[PDB]
């Protein structure tokens, strides 16, 4: 008669049930809680609610989708959708112009009373809180322990609730399942997958596999915060566009304002901090902004290969890089004359290096004797420094940069 | 039917509480302080035995199971209705006692080597777990040799906590795809993964995967006890706030008061020990307190990199660290005259070290000749010791590193 009678009677009781062809499960949405259950589970629910087990579930057929920018239901290309994003209490919160003070001292302690980066991080957080999109930039908090990184992720975890992943470590990565990425606005990882993570930052779609559900490709809303107590947590390239790095070495127990209860006082102020974020006026040009802090510049120049730097010093004829790396030791160990010591650095700046001097340079930077064949296949050829050639210096075989 | 909770009420008469758990799609049955999650066909076999008939529809409520000792047996938050899965074991509902049974006191004195401050700090930690039933964010590592009583202290606490404790979790259970040893536990004991464990101590939520149950995120109540007979059981940073370390080298067979029966006499005193913990006056400012015992400081400085210690010595211009590590050998091998041996130390103390001396210093500490490129890529640059630059000393322009 009416194939949606049960759907309507449960809506009166504030309960919205549909069938999700995509997962072959029934969706039930209660009081800011969306569950996916099998039919036999849903039949047990409606018997408790309406006193009878219908043999046929008279409910509509929607496609579940987690999109926080869209209505409770919408449709596109004829297929009708129902939304799986339901905000937690502390996202539906009245704005505030200024944040609770003990929360303000926690972040100031984290950012070392630097306003530009702390304000840039809060602008990033506020954007996630208000606009609920993927930013494509992640924040790495590192340094020492007891600095507040663990608290700020428990502070945000009370704000974002089910939409945040807390302390995902290699134990969950080794799992065949992906639950920490399914319908999340923030994903926290503890300690750090060099490319597995760098991809998640800018992916729109991930394959979500979770236990007793179909493996499904959903759109990606994850923003990553990464805590690490190692000196070099990840390999970062010099052209990077994904990572902001903040090193904090101020321990919270050693500060003026800290008590034992401050950990739970800061946590019991989650409402105030959420109300602050709700009131930030976001600058959308600076959510995907990364800055090259000298801690990040430190991570990059320890990470990038030394053979790459030799090749690029060779390319830019940067004699000053070689002498910063101790090339002048070649003369005090009398490997080279004072006459030949000026021919050798002439060869670097000139971009025409005889095989004789090519080995002298590489062996003094690297600290072991390398052959010309090795130098070409590990420094010259892969980084395209130049061509090995006969040059009229007598016929000297040299490499000409270019 | 008439009342879609008729069956629920009739089993409560027999003292039996059954619900349906939307979160696990299983039926929960709670009997005599012990909770099961079963399939529908199993629960129908249970109620047939109780009421003599098999209902077609299970007239029971729909709750969400949650393990929170702070909350009532049922409650609600938002519209969602909850039922509690924590039900304390007998020796948690027991009348306190002001003083501990004697044979249990000699074990803890023996474990802690008759030091009261550290033993009392551990009992204060235990008492907090017993009285307040929360996660402390601090773990205890018992170390040393074998027969000291650490294993017995774990069977003693396992009789108190029973179902709320995980006993002798080893590498076999970690390699399993399942997590049952962390599901609804107040104490978790590990026998003998540096970051997997350092995170569990301070996490609020774990993803619990168990055999025939859905993988589900639950609240974390675990406090960790760690036994190990290796000299360096874990890597500990100097700023650590999670670990207390106790090394014990008193074997119990070698002590005066020990007999064959002492092992099971201590075990038959679980009630007396539980009542003592119930009566401890807890100081909560000291439950998450960690102390750096001389064994912990050994673990820290065995673990931290030599390049980090060099980099920090360079930073603090601590000439005495270098000579503590034998830098003066540079003079006994006549690598250096008596005169640059004075430039080399003032170069360290001034924080301005010519490349010439920087390689001499590093080679005598590390024991192999390293290049300037290597020193910057592994000591200078990563720990931000300073900038390599041309500095004008005397008349020549000397390449140096300026600490700052």
Numbering used by the authors:
A (entry chain E): 305 to 496, 507 to 707, 710 to 718
B (entry chain D): 304 to 495, 507 to 718
Quote the original article:
NrS-1 polymerase is a multidomain enzyme and is one key component of the phage replisome. The N-terminal Prim/Pol and HBD domains are responsible for DNA polymerization and de novo primer synthesis activities of NrS-1 polymerase. Here, we report two crystal structures, showing that NrS-1 CTR adopts one unique hexameric ring-shaped conformation. Although the central helicase domain of NrS-1 CTR shares structural similarity with the superfamily III helicases, the folds of the Head and Tail domains are completely novel.
Totally, two NrS-1 CTR structures were determined, one in A-form and another in B-form. The A-form crystals were grown in P212121 space group; per asymmetric unit contains six copies of NrS-1 CTR monomer, which were assembled into a ring-shaped architecture. NrS-1 CTR assembles into ring-shaped hexamer in both structures. The helicase domain forms hexameric ring in both A- and B-form NrS-1 CTR structures. NrS-1 CTR forms hexamer in both A- and B-form structures, however, as confirmed by the size-exclusion chromatographic analysis, NrS-1 N618 exists as a monomer.
